[model samples]
Target: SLNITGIQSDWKVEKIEFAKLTGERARSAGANGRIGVHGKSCTVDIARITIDGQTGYGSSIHMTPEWAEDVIGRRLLDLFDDRGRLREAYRLQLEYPVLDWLGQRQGKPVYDLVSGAHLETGASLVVPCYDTSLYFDDLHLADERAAVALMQEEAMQGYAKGQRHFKIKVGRGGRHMPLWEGTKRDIAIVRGISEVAGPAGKIMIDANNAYNLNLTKEVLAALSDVNLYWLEAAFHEDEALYEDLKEWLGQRGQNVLIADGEGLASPHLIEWATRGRVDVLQYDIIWPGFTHWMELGEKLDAHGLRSAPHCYGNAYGIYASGHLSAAVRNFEFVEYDDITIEGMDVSGYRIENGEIHVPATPGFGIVFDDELVTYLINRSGWSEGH
Candidate 1:
């Protein structure tokens, strides 16, 4: 959700017109930029800048193209209210779009442009992905039986569709239950999903930091018997707790990985990789761009860890994840959130057999229909700003 509380009214005035984006699953993203200098201006354009609109989580703050040109045009990074500090999260929209567009102008895909000095040139990659199964709680079912049922169905659906890996959330109320109830609820979901996934299938569970260290410790010990691929953000944000859990799990002898790192919004997840543990870092291409994701991969690989981009929001965002996964040679896998855009046609970018391939076409390898484009521009409006 975006809060424009102290934002200037002039800033709120629309400048860039978003005909708008459509997405049921991947729900966040968009941007624009001007390639120029003061008094000497040139309009830089891209073949297309397709974005998946944000939803489910909430509306994101938007600025006009005019605003984009002002900042990017003049190289002014002081737009945020808190100007002196780094607002990586807040500044993302303004920056990523411009980076993506610049990549287009440079005759390279976004991943290649952002790859910085870490990745190879003219390289194409392909990687596996895990289907993210989202679930909710219901007071209607006893002990969240209904929630477990939904998860089982989703796991089976993914498996039936050729997905070998499934990632589900864990919490007391939703992905979680009372610690005692949570262990019982968690085991049931893991065991149930595992059955649907079969022996060769993999299972990842995310608590989203819903459990305390005490409850988390107990839950880990309980789920140890089940074949968990990774336990994501099961503890608090304390890195000390992560180090301790890494040690504790070593004794358990379970091959399950202690995974995290989605919290870092800046470039390079090297800090998490520095722990020298087998943790799976969940970095995202959306935050700083896929170039840094490759950097994150290189950093993690040196320490023998692995990285994957987080997928939750809109369709193009998910497509971007697939592209990043392909670019990063050692990336564990991309997250395939089950979200799709309603009106957007993704025939060229569709995933088959639970795996998405890199398109030979330049850039992200996505294709939009002419009819859809016609429908889109009609529904869009321009932004007004100084």
Candidate 2:
């Protein structure tokens, strides 16, 4: 009888190890190991840490031992079989690392390992990135003059480097704006980017659900002259409203695609792809993981919609996403934040010219300056007991 014994249920940090190399540094970086089960034991340890300001692993991981044991020995097809946030994340922490480890041990990149004979290896192995200026920019509080200037700077620099795809933020006018000032200002920034990028440059606008249906209509109409490529997260992920917006846009010949699903799973992805009639789907690497991402990518392909991976939280995830993007065929461009690390344990990936050159190293091709791990584990307040 497989009697899974009972023990602690939360992720208990037991040990932490850090070393420093010298390359890109991080504010904090480390990983742990866990032990436990359901009805039996369940414990989580943070192992294989990457980048500063960890965004994926929260304090308490949520997975039952019963759930894990039932699927642990099963095929990879069962990864998202049930679909719970904690369950999915916890499973990835256990699975993705092992697969990556196997690939690395074999001296093969993840794409090559997963795809095998169908490996989508390319000559350049580079993927174009959509500029994430707003995440690190002050558009939330910048005045009109400063906002336009900031937009211009990003476009000018990106275009000069051969980057044609760019995403700019809209709608937030900060503390001192009048009723319609934010929208007006947001439109102004878009117009400014279009002017600098010219007719050849590609432009994308993300409002992060700042407007409703009526307001969304007005905003779309005003930016018609700029040839906006897509409007992302304009409203919350309401399937009905998203469908309505798509229909309205189509009727008017707007041609601007409605891109949503930034934080969605299979359920929402299915909804938007099927009933929502979305032109593009956005899924991030952190939540969906690489395994689930591959499934979703195929799902999108079957449904005939395009895929655009969302990444802005951490640079580590960006490296993983680069390879994932290369493996798939439908993605137009990948999202890239204007962020980088300093010191040791750094990322070998970088944005050159207008695109990011993903490392061809085996198993995701991510290299870290382990020497810098000392500062991350010590001064960052993360440790064994934490």
Steric overlap count per candidate? 23, 28
Worst 10 residues of 2 by lDDT: 31-40
What do the candidate models score in CA lDDT, each in turn? 0.53, 0.56
Q: TM-scores for all candidates?
A: 0.70, 0.72
Deviation in Å, model 2, residue 375 alpha carbon: 5.6
| Global lDDT of model 1 | 0.53
Highest lDDT scorer: 2
Q: Show model 1 residue runs off by greater than 4 Å.
A: 1-17, 25-63, 71-125, 137-139, 143-147, 173-179, 264-272, 369-386
lDDT of 1 at 67: 47
lDDT of 2 by residue, 99-183 (tens): 4443454566666654423434555577877665532243344577787887687677666655667787664533224438877
Provide the lDDT at 187 for model 2. Answer: 81
lDDT tens per residue, model 1, 83-168: 23224543344433433333343445545543443545665545677887434322235655675786677677666766788876
